[PDB]
Design a protein around this ligand. Structure first.
Ligand SMILES: [Zn+2]
Ligand SMILES: [Zn+2]
Lengths: 171, 171
C-alpha cells in the first residue's frame, strides 16, 4: 500500500539504518513492507526508495524505473530489491546529474558521483551479490544507499548555486 | 502593489545588483518601486526584501517587522529603506538563527553570522549613514544585503543536516 514519505527536516532521515537478518526476510511483515515500498515508490513516480524514507531504519532499498516521468531522460531501471548494501568506488571519474529526492519535494541539485562502483547486496530470497555497477544504475544505487547512512543529496551538492525548485530551473 | 517574488533556481538571484544613483531616487518610478516592494514584503509577511528578489538588479533593500508571524519570536524592526549598503563585520562573535527566505519558500536553515556589524547606506531622501548595528537587525541586514551580491542563505548553512521544510522541522 502507499505510505507517507518523510520530508527533509525529519530527524529519522539522518539516522543510521541497521542490517536485515536472514530470518527477517521470511516474516510476513517484511514481504508486506517490500510491498508497501513498491506501491509507494510507484505512486510517487519515483526511481528508487529507501526504507528510512518511510520511517524504517532498516537497510532496505527498492528501485524500478520504466518510462519515469520525473526524470524523463534517464534510461530504464529494472525492478529489484537491495538489502544490506555495501558500495565501494572503483574510480574518480564522476558523472554529473541533477538529482532529486521524494523526501526533498520539487527541487533539483547537480551532484557528481563516481560513475563506476562495486556494490554488494542480498535480495528477498537471501542471495548474495557482488557486482560492479556503472552508469545511471550506479548513480541511483549510490543516492539510495546514502539514505541508509542518514545522507541526503543536498549534502553532496556540487555547488549551492546549482540547486533550486523545479518550476523555476527552466519554467 | 504586490509583485512576483522570484524563487531559488532563477539565475537573477545570483547576479550582482548595481548602485542606485542620486538622480534615480527622484524618478517617479523609483518611488513606485519602493512602494511595490513594501506592498510585496507586507503581503508576504516578510521581514525584509531585496530588489533582486522581484527581478531588479538594483542595490535596494527594504525592511520592516511589527509582530511578524513567519518569525514569531524576533523583535520588531522599524520600516526603513537601505540603498547602496556596504557592511563590515566588527567581530567574530556570531549569533545563530534559523533563517528563512521568501525566495526559498517553506524552509528553514540554521545560519551563524557575526552579531555586530558596521553598515553604511543611503536612504530615499539621499542621506548617508554609517552606524554600527547589532542583534537581530544585524542578522536581517546581512541576510538582505547578501541578495545584492547574488547570495542566498542556503549558501551559508552551518550544516546541511540543520536545513529542511518548516512543516516537518517541528510538525
Ligand atoms: Zn532520496
Ligand atoms: Zn531572502
Amino acid at each position: 500500500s502507499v505510505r507517507k514519505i518523510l520530508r527533509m527536516g525529519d530527524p529519522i532521515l539522518r539516522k543510521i539504518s541497521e542490517p536485515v537478518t536472514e530470518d527477517e526476510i521470511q516474516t510476513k511483515e517484511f514481504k508486506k513492507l517490500i510491498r508497501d515500498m513498491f506501491d509507494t515508490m510507484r505512486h510517487a513516480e519515483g526511481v528508487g526508495l529507501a526504507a528510512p524514507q518511510i520511517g524504517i531504519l532498516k537497510q532496505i532499498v527498492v528501485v524500478g524505473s520504466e518510462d519515469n516521468e520525473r526524470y524523463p531522460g534517464t534510461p530504464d531501471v529494472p525492478e529489484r530489491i537491495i538489502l544490506n548494501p555495501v558500495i565501494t568506488p572503483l574510480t574518480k571519474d564522476t558523472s554529473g546529474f541533477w538529482e532529486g529526492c521524494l523526501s526533498v519535494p520539487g527541487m533539483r541539485g547537480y551532484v557528481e558521483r563516481p560513475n563506476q562502483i562495486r556494490m554488494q547486496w542480498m535480495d528477498e530470497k537471501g542471495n548474495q551479490f557482488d557486482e560492479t555497477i556503472d552508469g545511471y544504475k550506479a548513480i541511483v544505487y549510490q543516492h539510495e544507499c546514502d539514505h541508509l547512512q542518514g545522507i541526503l543529496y543536498v549534502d553532496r551538492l556540487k555547488d549551492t548555486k546549482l540547486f533550486g525548485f523545479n518550476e523555476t530551473l527552466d519554467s
